[PDB]
Amino acid sequence: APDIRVPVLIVGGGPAGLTAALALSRYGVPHLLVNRHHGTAHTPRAHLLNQRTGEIFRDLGIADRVEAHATPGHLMANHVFMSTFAGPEVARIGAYGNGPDRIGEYRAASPSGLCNLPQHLLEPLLVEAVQEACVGQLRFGHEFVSLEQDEHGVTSRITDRRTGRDYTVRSDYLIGADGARSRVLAQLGIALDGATGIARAVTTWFEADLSRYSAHRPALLYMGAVPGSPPADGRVFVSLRPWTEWLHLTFPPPTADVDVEDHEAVRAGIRESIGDPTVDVTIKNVSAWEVNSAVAPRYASGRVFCVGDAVHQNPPTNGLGLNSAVADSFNLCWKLKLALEGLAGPGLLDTYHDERQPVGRQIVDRAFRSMVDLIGIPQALGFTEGQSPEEQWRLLDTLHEDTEEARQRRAALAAATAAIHGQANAHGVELGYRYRTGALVPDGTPEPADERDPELYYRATTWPGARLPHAWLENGRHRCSTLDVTGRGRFTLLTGPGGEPWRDAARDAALDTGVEVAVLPIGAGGGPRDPYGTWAELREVEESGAVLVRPDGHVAWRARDHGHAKELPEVMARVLHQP
Amino acid sequence: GTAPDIRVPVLIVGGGPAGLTAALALSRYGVPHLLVNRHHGTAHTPRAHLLNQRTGEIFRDLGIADRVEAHATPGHLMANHVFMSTFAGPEVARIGAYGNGPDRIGEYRAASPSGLCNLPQHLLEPLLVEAVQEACVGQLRFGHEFVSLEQDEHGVTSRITDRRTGRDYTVRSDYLIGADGARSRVLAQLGIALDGATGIARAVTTWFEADLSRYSAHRPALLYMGAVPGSPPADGRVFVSLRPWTEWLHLTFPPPTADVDVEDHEAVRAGIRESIGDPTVDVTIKNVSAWEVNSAVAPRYASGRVFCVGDAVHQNPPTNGLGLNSAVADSFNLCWKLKLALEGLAGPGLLDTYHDERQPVGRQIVDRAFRSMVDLIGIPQALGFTEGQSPEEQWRLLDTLHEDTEEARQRRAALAAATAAIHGQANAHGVELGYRYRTGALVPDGTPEPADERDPELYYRATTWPGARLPHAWLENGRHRCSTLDVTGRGRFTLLTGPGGEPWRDAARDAALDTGVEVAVLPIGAGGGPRDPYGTWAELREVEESGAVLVRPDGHVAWRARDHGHAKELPEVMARVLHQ
Amino acid sequence: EAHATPGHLMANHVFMSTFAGPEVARIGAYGNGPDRIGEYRAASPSGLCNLPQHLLEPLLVEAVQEACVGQLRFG
Amino acid sequence: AFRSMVDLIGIPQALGFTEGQSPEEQWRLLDTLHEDTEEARQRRAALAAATAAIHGQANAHGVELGYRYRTGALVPDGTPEPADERDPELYYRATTWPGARLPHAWLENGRHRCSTLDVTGRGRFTLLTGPGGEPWRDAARDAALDTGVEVAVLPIGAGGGPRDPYGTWAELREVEESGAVLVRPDGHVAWRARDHGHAKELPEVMARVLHQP
Numbered sequence A: 001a002p003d004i005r006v007p008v009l010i011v012g013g014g015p016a017g018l019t020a021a022l023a024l025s026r027y028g029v030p031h032l033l034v035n036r037h038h039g040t041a042h043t044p045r046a047h048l049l050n051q052r053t054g055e056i057f058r059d060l061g062i063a064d065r066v067e068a069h070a071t072p073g074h075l076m077a078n079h080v081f082m083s084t085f086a087g088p089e090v091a092r093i094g095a096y097g098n099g100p101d102r103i104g105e106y107r108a109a110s111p112s113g114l115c116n117l118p119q120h121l122l123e124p125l126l127v128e129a130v131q132e133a134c135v136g137q138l139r140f141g142h143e144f145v146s147l148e149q150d151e152h153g154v155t156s157r158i159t160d161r162r163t164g165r166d167y168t169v170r171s172d173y174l175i176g177a178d179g180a181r182s183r184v185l186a187q188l189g190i191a192l193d194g195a196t197g198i199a200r201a202v203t204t205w206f207e208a209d210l211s212r213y214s215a216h217r218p219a220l221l222y223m224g225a226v227p228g229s230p231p232a233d234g235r236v237f238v239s240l241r242p243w244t245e246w247l248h249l250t251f252p253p254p255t256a257d258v259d260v261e262d263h264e265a266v267r268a269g270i271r272e273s274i275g276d277p278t279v280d281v282t283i284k285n286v287s288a289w290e291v292n293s294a295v296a297p298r299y300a301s302g303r304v305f306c307v308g309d310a311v312h313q314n315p316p317t318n319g320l321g322l323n324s325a326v327a328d329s330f331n332l333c334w335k336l337k338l339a340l341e342g343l344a345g346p347g348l349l350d351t352y353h354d355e356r357q358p359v360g361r362q363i364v365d366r367a368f369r370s371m372v373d374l375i376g377i378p379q380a381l382g383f384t385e386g387q388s389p390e391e392q393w394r395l396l397d398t399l400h401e402d403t404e405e406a407r408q409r410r411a412a413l414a415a416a417t418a419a420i421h422g423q424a425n426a427h428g429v430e431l432g433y434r435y436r437t438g439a440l441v442p443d444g445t446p447e448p449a450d451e452r453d454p455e456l457y458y459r460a461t462t463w464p465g466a467r468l469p470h471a472w473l474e475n476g477r478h479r480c481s482t483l484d485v486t487g488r489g490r491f492t493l494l495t496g497p498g499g500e501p502w503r504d505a506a507r508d509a510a511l512d513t514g515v516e517v518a519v520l521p522i523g524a525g526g527g528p529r530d531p532y533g534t535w536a537e538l539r540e541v542e543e544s545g546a547v548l549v550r551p552d553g554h555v556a557w558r559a560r561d562h563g564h565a566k567e568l569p570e571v572m573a574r575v576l577h578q579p
Numbered sequence B: 001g002t003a004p005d006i007r008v009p010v011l012i013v014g015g016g017p018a019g020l021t022a023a024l025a026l027s028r029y030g031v032p033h034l035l036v037n038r039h040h041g042t043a044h045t046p047r048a049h050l051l052n053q054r055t056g057e058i059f060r061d062l063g064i065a066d067r068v069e070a071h072a073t074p075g076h077l078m079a080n081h082v083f084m085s086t087f088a089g090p091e092v093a094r095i096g097a098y099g100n101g102p103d104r105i106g107e108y109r110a111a112s113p114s115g116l117c118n119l120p121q122h123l124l125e126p127l128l129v130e131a132v133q134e135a136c137v138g139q140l141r142f143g144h145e146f147v148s149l150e151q152d153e154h155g156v157t158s159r160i161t162d163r164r165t166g167r168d169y170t171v172r173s174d175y176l177i178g179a180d181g182a183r184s185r186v187l188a189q190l191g192i193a194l195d196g197a198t199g200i201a202r203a204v205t206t207w208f209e210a211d212l213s214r215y216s217a218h219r220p221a222l223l224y225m226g227a228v229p230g231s232p233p234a235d236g237r238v239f240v241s242l243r244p245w246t247e248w249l250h251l252t253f254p255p256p257t258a259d260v261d262v263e264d265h266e267a268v269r270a271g272i273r274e275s276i277g278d279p280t281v282d283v284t285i286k287n288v289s290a291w292e293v294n295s296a297v298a299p300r301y302a303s304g305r306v307f308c309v310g311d312a313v314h315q316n317p318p319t320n321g322l323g324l325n326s327a328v329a330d331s332f333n334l335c336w337k338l339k340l341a342l343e344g345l346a347g348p349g350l351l352d353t354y355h356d357e358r359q360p361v362g363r364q365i366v367d368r369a370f371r372s373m374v375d376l377i378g379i380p381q382a383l384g385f386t387e388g389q390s391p392e393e394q395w396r397l398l399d400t401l402h403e404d405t406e407e408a409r410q411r412r413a414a415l416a417a418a419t420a421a422i423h424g425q426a427n428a429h430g431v432e433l434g435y436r437y438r439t440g441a442l443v444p445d446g447t448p449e450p451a452d453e454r455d456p457e458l459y460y461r462a463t464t465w466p467g468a469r470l471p472h473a474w475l476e477n478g479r480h481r482c483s484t485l486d487v488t489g490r491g492r493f494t495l496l497t498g499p500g501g502e503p504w505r506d507a508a509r510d511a512a513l514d515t516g517v518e519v520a521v522l523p524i525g526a527g528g529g530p531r532d533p534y535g536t537w538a539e540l541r542e543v544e545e546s547g548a549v550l551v552r553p554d555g556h557v558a559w560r561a562r563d564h565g566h567a568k569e570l571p572e573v574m575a576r577v578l579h580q
Numbered sequence C: 001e002a003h004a005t006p007g008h009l010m011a012n013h014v015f016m017s018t019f020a021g022p023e024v025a026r027i028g029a030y031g032n033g034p035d036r037i038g039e040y041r042a043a044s045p046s047g048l049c050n051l052p053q054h055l056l057e058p059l060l061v062e063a064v065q066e067a068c069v070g071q072l073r074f075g
Numbered sequence D: 001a002f003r004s005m006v007d008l009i010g011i012p013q014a015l016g017f018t019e020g021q022s023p024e025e026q027w028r029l030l031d032t033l034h035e036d037t038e039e040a041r042q043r044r045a046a047l048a049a050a051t052a053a054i055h056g057q058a059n060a061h062g063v064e065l066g067y068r069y070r071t072g073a074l075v076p077d078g079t080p081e082p083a084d085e086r087d088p089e090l091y092y093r094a095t096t097w098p099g100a101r102l103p104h105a106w107l108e109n110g111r112h113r114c115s116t117l118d119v120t121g122r123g124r125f126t127l128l129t130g131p132g133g134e135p136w137r138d139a140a141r142d143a144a145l146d147t148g149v150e151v152a153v154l155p156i157g158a159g160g161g162p163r164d165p166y167g168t169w170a171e172l173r174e175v176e177e178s179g180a181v182l183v184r185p186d187g188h189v190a191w192r193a194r195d196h197g198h199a200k201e202l203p204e205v206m207a208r209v210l211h212q213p
């Protein structure tokens, strides 16, 4: 007999696991989380939160706690290429939708902005919100060893690392959120497709007042090249607390000895990157780690589902890792809640893989390409191996000359700079992904498309699978997004004038399935107003039509007009994958 | 068989604290409702103001507690209950108030996570509205006047006016919430006449700004009760602190004679300056209101599928400040019960328990407040004030109070005994927090109710006896501090247990299958759950470690069991609770 | 800029019945609307702001008086 | 301003508001705006079309910022005035076409951020140029002989002058690196030249701008 019985076991307490713990909390699903380490992350790691993470954080009711601590969007307004921090600059683009040409789209696209909050601050927030909710249990210092599963459940073996005692956990479902080199994913016999240790990195967390060098060009990422270095020896400064707290990343060649603990050598390397020897640098941590680029071909097996780093790893370019993990967990949890209530088949749980596995392929591919893009900048300048500091200063100096060589270098830099949008303004990747198969019913219409780069540019649509478009509504004198009045662990049917047939079809949906569908009319029936007419423009259905929104804010189904009301019951049974 | 303009599970008539609290409950449980309010705006003048510990707690469950504590007067600046002459003149007697006095403060802190604070209706009401329009689950129509209803086995039909357009429409509800205030239209419709009395006295409230900090800061109080010398006992002035010490209410009680003029902003301005006793004090009137003190309670709160809350069902003088508080609790008793009937999880027997539970509480508060009004005159009567005394004759009765005579010793005696009775309104801890439901949505465990020899109106006594408000203890869930009252409520049944209480897991599983309602099992100081750092919970829970306390969404105990032996009875207990 | 209402607080142009009553129509204003904010930011180092004539006129006087090059005779 | 004043009445007219109507009728016409009739449909169209016209006062970016001097203290360069499909009252189009307000771009001088508008104006004529624009130096000196008026030559992106960190100025200037934009003290463009070829024209150009004999 097992030592513990619990509906869901979450293995790992990083962003993925804690998000799942939170979502299950809000849904009232009792669960247990085990984390190997006795504490949350002690160093910053991931830090950029994108608009989609914002929306999920609103749905989970911690957005305000997050916003209180985070760097706001405007202080990440550029992406900088430079020599040293104190030396001349090479190129600059707007970043994160701050440039004039992107800001309108970024504002229209989401109630949420982008912000910067490092893991060591974000994890405690998620912990606190879980503890407050008091629905599930966090066990830090408990390491998952192994699992066996059957038709009825999952049996897991756990080690208390203080006592040394083993114990067993019987659960209906198990969430593998145990990071890169997942013990859970290995236990399932799923191997990652991709590559391991494609490069090495040394991330120093440090304090130093570099505001003299950064305030006038606020950025998340300052990317430098010390004259006299090969192009691959880039130095990356990441702003953590403008302008006194930073990360510094170097990429040592395979033929090199990394001494994490040689704080002296690390500090002199940081002084060299800064290009000012009078700057006081306080080292807070130094970490070596291996860049991977891999994705699991299967996210799930039976009653075990893996999320986050367990199933996708990639270089930090684009900052898609943490965001994707959050969205991975947010895709899964509502599905578990329905299964445990007997209101959904295992067919619904299969849709976690279906919907999120393509998204992992996409982010890994995008991150990779963006990494490769970085080297194009020093290459464009003419930088190579076996060059003195003097030759490289001369190349920077002569970039602005009135010669053919200079003109081509300027043109090549332009083109190389332009590719960096695919990491700094990749709005289509961040917000614009659409599930093409899964817990959703096609309406027959073709997926919208246009001639613009679908990685860079987001196109709002209610096409089943897409994230529900944001529009500002007014409910009395309260302003709220379309996304605020949907989600929250429930299915919502958005309707308008002439949509009275949807009331009885939703009532019938619920008799046939057991799943309440909230009918919420917009600019009719006394519902929220559409003050600017945005929702009318974006809903892509007639006034009498409907958009059905999942608890995760993705569109499950849409219908042009009320003539489709009678199909709702059947649509809900297909989405719920019920017999 | 006409055609109703609107089908909606619950109609709530009247958008005051009672009304809005109900909407906010029903909002948080995710129940589609409609509320209609006869006035276009929310209340514009202060009126009610004292929030007691239980309102505190309810606010935390509904999750507007912070939003309410932000605007509110903290409980330390309500430290006293002051009897005086004028506000600049000598003082008569004083006691600690709202558990700020040394001999009560222990009991007040131990009793609740929440404290007492001050927030006037015109500030509160908005916050309730805000919360409701953020939740977006039901709908608030201001400027809509309820007219009439009919009901049957299957629902209620309600005729409404839109007062702007003039047009009439009709609502069909399953259930209807009569929250329409004093002189309840809805309770008329039902044929239920209040027991008691209307217009027992008349009063004049003057909401006014004036810097009296020189007179109030050094003895902080909600309630300053003066007698201007040369006045009969009943001509008590009453100052209430709203924004210390610049904003205020002033209340007089004009005799049956007296021609009262709301509009006369100069006569009222002169009365105030007299009451203060300092003619150089700037006094900016903001509102003056006549109103009639009532003293009545409905003998029935519900009839069929129609349920009344707040003033609609209990009216009383503002002594003890129970009206607002009780109205909040009324709404909170009821909502969770509607939800479980709406989802076919509970019979009409569960909705009968709203009356059974909150009606005795209406009797209690109306009585308590009346008695507390009657006491107030005991102070000026002890001083030996009467009708037909000069200013110069009263000043002397104050002056010679502190003298070596036989007159003075006995007047100081009677002053102390009258002063002693004001505890009834200033520290009424058992009335505020200690009311228990003896019959309703609960199973008695067979134990006799706890008693003691302490006055049960003044002294709260924590118990998990079914019907009692769950006792407050400080828990710790990891590094998060929370009350027993935080880890319970929130729209669901909670079972609190401890070491050896694993059997409750299966009992709770079986109860959910049989009844459809989910019981969440929370072990304390066992199984890696929330801890009991001081062991307080082990003291108060009045069951063994292996036992259980079943908490309702409203934070009252539904049932308890001494030990895990009783695990088998839980399915049937939840059946009986839900009136299946 | 010190004394003036910043542009983001003039975000809309509102059509209503009464100020506490219902609203009738609303558009973004002064380039605060998502479809105009890009052109407005790109077009000028300066934004729009609100400063009434009774506040602006003295600032102009002040800076004229400080420059001391010409002469203001009022009245 | 006149047209925008006329537009305002359109809003109440759309709603069907008229004279001799009671509070109670008008509260009704607001209530019955969302009705599914031929009446309310035509109203609702008229409101959204009357609403649309208000952009002419709330987002009149082209009038506010986009006016250009077609005759005055400037010399046309023989190019046609830029124009597009868009309504020229609502939509601004940055151009260095003489007479227009000099386009804004963020430059950087050391670590000091400044607009093209900040490094020009201030009581002087300023000539903006770039790589290969050395010839403008001599031409400016010659111009100050011929005319008495000093022309500060400011190379952007060359010769250690202010930088154009985003490339924006190179996009907006509508001349070649070696060309020149001549900016009046008021921030409008007096003249422009595709490339350094035209450098000898400057003395003449400054003479015509000042209407000197």
Ligand SMILES: Cc1cc2nc3c(=O)[nH]c(=O)nc-3n(C[C@H](O)[C@H](O)[C@H](O)COP(=O)(O)OP(=O)(O)OC[C@H]3O[C@@H](n4cnc5c(N)ncnc54)[C@H](O)[C@@H]3O)c2cc1C
Pocket: A011, A012, A013, A014, A015, A016, A017, A034, A035, A036, A037, A045, A046, A047, A048, A049, A142, A143, A144, A145, A177, A178, A179, A180, A183, A203, A289, A307, A308, A309, A310, A316, A318, A319, A320, A321, A322, A323, A324, A325
């Ligand atoms: C310098 C750097 C910058 C980055 N920048 C960004 C960014 O800006 N934005 C962004 O979105 N992403 C970014 N990423 C990626 C980000 O760090 C990860 O993608 C993110 O941590 C994913 O979370 P996870 O919870 O899946 O995994 P993890 O953070 O690895 O957490 C998994 C947890 O499971 C635990 N665990 C492992 N094995 C066991 C076991 N047997 N039992 C119990 N527990 C176990 C671990 O202790 C760990 O706490 C960055 C990464 C780095 C290194």
Ligand SMILES: Cc1cc2nc3c(=O)[nH]c(=O)nc-3n(C[C@H](O)[C@H](O)[C@H](O)COP(=O)(O)OP(=O)(O)OC[C@H]3O[C@@H](n4cnc5c(N)ncnc54)[C@H](O)[C@@H]3O)c2cc1C
Pocket: B013, B014, B015, B016, B017, B018, B019, B036, B037, B038, B039, B042, B043, B046, B047, B048, B049, B050, B051, B121, B144, B145, B146, B179, B180, B181, B182, B185, B205, B309, B310, B311, B312, B318, B320, B321, B322, B323, B324, B325, B326, B327
């Ligand atoms: C001066 C004063 C001081 C007080 N002191 C305190 C104190 O310190 N502490 C305390 O706890 N209590 C106090 N009380 C009691 C408290 O003010 C009231 O009991 C409380 O306001 C009751 O709220 P309610 O929801 O029952 O109804 P109400 O407050 O009467 O609100 C009902 C609302 O509905 C509207 N309405 C009325 N009729 C209709 C209709 N037919 N249809 C639709 N809408 C309608 C009204 O505009 C009103 O806003 C005091 C009362 C007064 C007057």
Ligand SMILES: C/C=C(\C)[C@H](O)[C@H](C)/C=C(C)/C=C/C/C(C)=C/Cc1nc(OC)cc(O)c1C
Pocket: A048, A199, A221, A231, A232, A233, A234, A235, A236, A238, A249, A251, A291, A315, A316, A317, A318, A319, A320, A371, A372, A374, A375
């Ligand atoms: C110039 C040449 C270089 C830098 C190397 O040789 C090779 C080509 C690049 C590598 C190994 C890329 C590592 C990833 C990187 C530097 C990402 C920038 C980043 N982007 C984020 O997006 C939010 C968040 C981040 O914390 C970070 C640090």
Ligand SMILES: C/C=C(\C)[C@H](O)[C@H](C)/C=C(C)/C=C/C/C(C)=C/Cc1nc(OC)cc(O)c1C
Pocket: B047, B048, B049, B050, B201, B222, B223, B233, B234, B235, B236, B237, B238, B240, B251, B253, B293, B317, B318, B319, B320, B321, B373, B374, B376, B377, B380
């Ligand atoms: C001295 C004699 C007087 C004042 C009268 O003749 C009679 C006896 C009293 C009457 C008719 C009514 C008294 C009601 C009152 C002043 C209650 C005090 C109060 N107590 C609260 O409890 C927190 C909150 C409050 O806002 C208020 C105002």
Ligand SMILES: [Cl-]
Pocket: A057, A058, A061, A062, A063, A064, A065
């Ligand atoms: Cl939030």
Ligand SMILES: [Cl-]
Pocket: A046, A314, A315, A316, A317, A318, A319, A320, A321, A322
């Ligand atoms: Cl990442």
Ligand SMILES: [Cl-]
Pocket: B059, B060, B062, B063, B064, B065, B066, B067
């Ligand atoms: Cl709260």
Ligand SMILES: [Cl-]
Pocket: B316, B317, B318, B319, B320, B321, B322, B323, B324, B369
């Ligand atoms: Cl009261």
